[PDB]
């Protein structure tokens, strides 16, 4: 029943999908909050030893300059799948469309890599549920959750991982229909400090935004006609700033 990708259950569904979901819940807590001019995405880092460099873990990886991600679930699965995601994005949708793809479209490709890893029995699907946030000039700022069940959902605010259930009511309570990015950045840290305490500090919590265009990150100038990276990773020093004013 539960226990092949091939076998359907009496009430249906594959069990491997359910067990892969279990994996996510053993993960770390990542959460996203949509503001009216951004999306803030936040997660923490752990590594066991403190002798570990924390700036070497990849968990906030830009897929494109327009679209950042986090995960909860398996660490190994992330790096591989981020790698694959990027590769597909240029083949199907940057050699054709001529620019880095839509937030909606790219979320569908990611789901399609998962889906292929469910169809082929003896091959497990990815351990991760990602949050993929981005911007496009048609559908605006957007936020998604793409599950290891190969389905994706759009969301207003969401959290995934172990601490998800505690975070979601904070999100219900504290979300309002009109927010700024700066009130979202503070709400993001506040909620994430529920997930852990005794170790939360600006050098071990990794937090980024997909906000407004920044020509500061564009790296070539004197071309006004294109936009710069929507994405911005905030440094360790910024994360400490926001944690003091909170």
């Amino acid at each position: 029943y539960s226990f092949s990708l091939t076998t359907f259950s009496p009430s249906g569904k594959l069990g491997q999908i359910d067990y892969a979901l279990t994996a996510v819940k053993q993960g770390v807590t990542s959460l996203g909050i949509k503001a009216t001019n951004g999306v803030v995405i936040a997660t923490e880092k752990k590594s066991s030893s403190p002798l570990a460099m924390s700036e070497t873990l990849s968990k906030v990886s830009l897929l494109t300059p327009d679209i950042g991600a986090v995960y909860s679930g398996m660490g190994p699965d992330y790096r591989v799948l981020v790698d694959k995601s990027r590769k597909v994005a240029h083949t199907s949708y940057k050699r054709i469309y001529g620019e880095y793809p839509p937030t909606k479209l790219l979320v569908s490709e990611v789901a399609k890599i998962m889906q292929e890893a469910t169809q082929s029995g003896g091959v497990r699907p990815f351990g991760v549920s990602l949050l993929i946030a981005g911007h496009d000039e048609f559908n605006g700022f957007s936020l998604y959750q793409v599950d290891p069940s190969g389905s994706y959902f759009p969301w207003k605010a969401t959290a995934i991982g172990k601490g998800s259930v505690a975070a979601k009511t904070f999100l219900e309570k504290r979300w309002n229909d009109e927010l700024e990015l700066e009130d979202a950045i503070h709400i993001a840290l506040l909620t994430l400090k529920e997930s852990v305490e005794g170790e939360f500090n600006g050098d071990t919590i990794e937090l980024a935004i997909i906000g407004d265009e920044n020509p500061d990150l564009l790296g070539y100038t004197g071309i006004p006609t294109d936009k710069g990276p929507r994405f911005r990773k905030l440094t360790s020093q910024e994360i400490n700033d926001r944690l003091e004013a909170l």
Binding site: S58, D83, R86, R95, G219, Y220
Partner: protein
């Protein structure tokens, strides 16, 4: 077309004209001959416009993919080697001539690459139709070690001689200055040698000066219930 590169101490400049000719007729008066491989690598195209355009795009996506993968700054050095490989595979059945230059942490580099897969390094290069006309200007007027100032002046001078003696090189000069650890400066239409001459009559007339037979609306959108 004409393309030059001038190596200087604190970076490298790549200049190329805006006109594109496909036969004896001018395809475009203004259209870019500075294609973007990566934010710190730029290159200009010569030869058949289609082959250069396609190649730059193909290699460009791979070097942006590489930057993310190696989690460090895009090398000029990566780019050339990968590009060279790409060129080899067709066996010279692709007609791309390029000057690629950039700044990376290994420093500034200025390369020439041919359709065959012959590869060269100098401290001053050119390729294209009007390469012989610019080459003369570089060898004489260049010396080893330059400031920003002298490099930009010498680059626009070479294209400018290009326009005046080369048929396929025309119109304006677009210059891109890549200094080591600084933003590329894309200075669109830095130099004009000859501005436009206007036409001497107005050619706009009333309607019915051109005959109509039928007038129709063609669809482009979906109707409602009205």
């Amino acid at each position: 077309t004409t393309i030059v590169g001038v190596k200087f101490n604190n970076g490298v400049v790549i200049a190329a004209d805006t006109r594109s000719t496909q036969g004896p007729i001018v395809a475009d008066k203004n259209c870019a001959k500075l294609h973007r491989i990566s934010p710190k690598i730029w290159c200009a195209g010569a030869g058949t416009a289609a082959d250069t355009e396609a190649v730059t795009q193909l290699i460009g996506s791979n070097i942006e993919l590489h930057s993310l993968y190696t989690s460090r700054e895009p090398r000029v050095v990566s780019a050339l080697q990968m590009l060279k490989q790409h060129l080899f595979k067709y066996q010279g059945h692709i007609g791309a001539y390029l000057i690629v230059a950039g700044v990376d942490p290994t420093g500034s580099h200025l390369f020439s690459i041919h359709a065959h897969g012959s590869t060269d390094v100098g401290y001053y290069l050119s390729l294209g139709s009007g390469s012989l006309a610019a080459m003369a200007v570089l060898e004489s007027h260049w010396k080893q070690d330059l400031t920003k100032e002298e490099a930009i002046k010498l680059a626009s001078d070479a294209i400018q001689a290009g326009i005046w003696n080369d048929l396929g090189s025309g119109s304006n000069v677009d210059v891109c200055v890549m200094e080591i650890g600084k933003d590329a400066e894309y200075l669109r239409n830095y130099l004009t040698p000859n501005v436009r001459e206007e036409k001497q009559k107005s050619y706009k007339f009333p309607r019915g000066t051109t005959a109509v037979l039928k007038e129709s609306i063609v669809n482009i959108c979906d109707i409602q219930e009205e």
